[PDB]
Design a protein around this nucleic acid. Sequence first.
RNA 1: UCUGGUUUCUCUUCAGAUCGCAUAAAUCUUUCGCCUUUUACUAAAGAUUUCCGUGGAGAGGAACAACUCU
RNA 2: CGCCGCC
Lengths: 111, 243, 222, 325, 292, 34
Amino acid sequence: NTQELLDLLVKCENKIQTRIKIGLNSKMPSRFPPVVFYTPKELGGLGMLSMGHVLIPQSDLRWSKQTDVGITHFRSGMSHEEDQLIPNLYRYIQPWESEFIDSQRVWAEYA
Amino acid sequence: SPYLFSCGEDKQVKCWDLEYNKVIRHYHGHLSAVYGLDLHPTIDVLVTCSRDSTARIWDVRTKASVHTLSGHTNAVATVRCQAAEPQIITGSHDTTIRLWDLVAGKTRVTLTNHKKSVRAVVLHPRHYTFASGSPDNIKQWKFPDGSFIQNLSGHNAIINTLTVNSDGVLVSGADNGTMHLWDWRTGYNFQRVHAAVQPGSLDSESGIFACAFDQSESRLLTAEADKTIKVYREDDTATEETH
Amino acid sequence: TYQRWQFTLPMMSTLYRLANQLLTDLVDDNYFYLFDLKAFFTSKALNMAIPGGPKFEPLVRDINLQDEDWNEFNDINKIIIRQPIRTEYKIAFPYLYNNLPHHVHLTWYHTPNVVFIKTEDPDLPAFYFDPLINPISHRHSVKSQEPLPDDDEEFELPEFVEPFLKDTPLYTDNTANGIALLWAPRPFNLRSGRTRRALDIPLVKNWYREHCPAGQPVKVRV
Amino acid sequence: GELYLDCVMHDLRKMYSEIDIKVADPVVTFCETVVETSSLKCFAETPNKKNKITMIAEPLEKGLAEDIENEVVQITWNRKKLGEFFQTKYDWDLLAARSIWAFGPDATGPNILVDDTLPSEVDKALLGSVKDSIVQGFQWGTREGPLCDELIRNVKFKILDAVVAQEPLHRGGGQIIPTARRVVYSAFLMATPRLMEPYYFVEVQAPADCVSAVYTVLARRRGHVTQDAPIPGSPLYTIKAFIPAIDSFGFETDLRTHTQGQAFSLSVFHHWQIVPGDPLDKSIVIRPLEPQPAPHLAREFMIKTRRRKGLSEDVSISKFFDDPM
Amino acid sequence: KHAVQERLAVTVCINKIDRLILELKLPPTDAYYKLRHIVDEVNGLISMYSTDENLILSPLLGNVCFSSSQYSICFTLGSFAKIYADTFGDINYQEFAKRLWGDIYFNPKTRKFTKKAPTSSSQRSFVEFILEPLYKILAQVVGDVDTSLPRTLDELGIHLTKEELKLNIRPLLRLVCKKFFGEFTGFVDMCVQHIPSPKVGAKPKIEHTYTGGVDSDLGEAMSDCDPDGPLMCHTTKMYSTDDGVQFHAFGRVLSGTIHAGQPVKVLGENYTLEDEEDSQICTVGRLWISVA
Amino acid sequence: MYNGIGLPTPRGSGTNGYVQRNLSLVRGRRGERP
RNA sequence: UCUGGUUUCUCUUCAGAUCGCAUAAAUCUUUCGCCUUUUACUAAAGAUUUCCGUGGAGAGGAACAACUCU
RNA sequence: CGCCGCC
Ligand SMILES: [Mg+2]
């Protein structure tokens, strides 16, 4: 729900993307593809858990501060659009109210 | 001109334009800190005095050093300049005044007195006769050739400022807080006022670094070491009479 | 010194024919409604963008503020929205659709829409692409003066009974392309002028000051 | 219009008062009327509990509404002669035609009164019939609108019966004017009242190649295109249409954008028409955003001005209009 | 519609005939068809509110003057047969001038302005003496600036020197038809024909703007200044001054005169039901007339 | 901006911009082409 | 019958004009943005210059200048 | 409605 944090994750992840690239003196678009970062260390590579490639949402900026409006106009997050579709980190993390409803039934069944 | 000038110990001399509140000229060339500056009242130059040993004639509109007035042997604490000859008066920390030629650059006449250093000179502005300030014996001179008119009384701190009003009153402000009023005519120490510090400052931090009269010369306002501007006025009585 | 030049209209009409493929068919500044320079200056000043237009950085009018009671008293979900206020409306006239505008310029409004039939054939006033509702060969509904062809010849002196011209027609070979050159672009409606430097003349410059034709990649429109 | 109010706001900001000024979203002055006549008859009370003026309100025809709107009848005429005018024009009844007094708003707005539908003699004593208290009381009570503080127009009220105070210097002689106001629009609101939005007549000139674009950009804004006329001379030619003034906002810019600057339009005030819906309706859910193209945008269109400078809502006829004892 | 509702003198100056013919490029007969159509349309449009049934407009009444403000031409035939007259005519216009519209002239038998076509393709007198010569000036200056233009200047009798002939084709056109047509005589003769030249048409004016006032105000408002009347001058408009905070109001005087700081009884919209609830009478000794 | 929104600082954040439209909306009439 | 001059080269100040129907780079002062520090930078505002060019003016010739505008 | 490119 916190939109201002989803802007921040896209802002910060790209900033450490760029911080590694300036250590190679590169900063170049295709001299340092996102295969290099998002490949797990077990093959080699750096292995980093994306949350930037997420298509950060928007809404009408006039009526945003007024009222819960709904949803329109997805804004592109990280700058990668070639249909690689790097997985989010959020889908591998089991949500909270699901976790508590699992907790209630599991300890009930265990007793 | 509609702009003020500034100078400080960052070696920098600046022309703050007042119609925009921003620096526009930003003079350069002093090899050490920059102490005093003064404007020539008729033509558009600018005379600045430093810590190294020198004073400089900056040409406004060209920001170009017309002269470097190289004749002192230590820091040059203050400088005033006027329209009538002699043009420039530099009182320095090597205990001497000297009086300069603005045109040729050479000094006209140096004034060796003042066992301790001179740090404030001021000119009058009705008739001749400027006056200089030093820990020993604030003196008083006379413009063509320089001539020892008079010395003034025992205001014996290491004084910082001299200012003179058009009706002959003269304030000497010193480094230990004491500021002495005088008159130009006789030399009679008049008031001898010593102000307090404002609550935070310790007792031994009173000292006067600037004093200037108003254009009205009803207000005398002093900038002190207590991070405070103190603004003074007259008093409308009669019975504090002269002895 | 090659500073000044004067041509003649056949010599310039041929140059105007040769200089197509890079010269725009726009007869008036009416294609450029909300692509004018002043529309762009307003879009710069107002932090918004015409689609297909330039996107600048904000200026000193960055952040606004209104306390909660005041903007809550003016603007709730109370106003009668019917259709949204697009940004082309705000760039069009930035005063009733936009509170606090400044450093703002104010655009042009409807140059009078020149029509100008183009030609492919001789006989200059060919009268095509044009209907006509006036009933031909039979009309009267208004009273006319001198409705009595009765006075014989007394005052039409036959030395100059004639019109102002019959020694030359109302058209020739170089009056079709002459009035076609009357509505030409900027270098070609001159007949005379000065000499410009060869790097001073921008060739592909009426090209970008247009819309982008659709069906073009993202690289060429950015 | 748009450009007029633009130049107003430009001269207001940067010439006559150079303080920054917030504006609002534009919205129209709109109007009120009735569609058919009453379904009940009114009731009165004064602080003396002395009067009982029971009456109704019924529509008129739109042409004569424009006529009295546009000074075709004038109040300076002869009583029988203006009676003959309305008599032989609206095939009205003879005894009621001369019975009229001064008209609605400004004594020009079409909210006329006829005293004499129901029979000619009741009182006629001292006031006995509407002379100054009810006439000027209606003037004071027809410019301030009943339903959402917007004016009535093209709805006439006819008094059916009334009574005078015993001596209106002593009893109520200036205490029936607000009762007169309240009675008249009490009879109005019980009669299925409706609202009126203005329309603009728009004249487009447009080249033939981009001429369905104007059909789309006014058909989206609820526009009845009346006359597409190929004109002689100009190869560009004219469109003549009608659009609501609430959907005229950014009209010529939208029209001139879709036709890449070739088309052009002008817009002027036409006569008022009926919004699709009823203001009296309840059990009617209005989302805060999402404009209605619905048959119930009138209820929205009136609650969103009662939500304005406005009043409180729930205008069912129980409290200030009637008395279910 | 708003003018005849105020029953003002509806004359008309239709404009941009260069835009008719340099731009739409109509042949002369069809240009006459367009102009006859447009004058017939404004005639049939004025006669929608027929309190003034006799009042129609046509060129023959001196009621409509054609023009092109791009190139500064006055047109109308009561002023154009002057330019037929001063060079090589001796025509005695305004009987010749009221004769060229909607009737066909033909070259032999020297003149009989028929109601019929003598030759089976006979252009009218309006498109043989006045409109198509304007075509020949116009087309020969914007098509043939090098050849055939000194011939037409020698025929028209306009000398024009080497500096002013090197112009671009649009200002050269404006200068050549400015030196041809001279001054705007058509626009002022169209105002001798109509626009009732006040104190003559003052009766419906003072009737409609004032509320009655016979025997007190009506007969003196019908009079002129002749300084014996009231002051009684209207004001509808309020221009700004350059600084902006000063307003200068603006209006017409009807019977009277203001000199040097007269006390001025300022009426209002509802200050005077019969008498002034407020005046704030003013003393103004500067007032002066306006140009652009 | 077609209508309302985007990003004033495309060089601040680590994005390129290009707001899409939300293609998953639910309503009655939207289109312009067919 | 008399009056009688466009090119091209050098200087001479004035420029108030889309001096240029297009459009560089720098310095200063602030806010940005990347940033570890400094130059290379970012992209907005303000005020200044330099530079590539131009406009009207005095003079000196020479170029058919004697063809002839006048 | 499409940042980014390094001595
Ligand atoms: Mg270091």
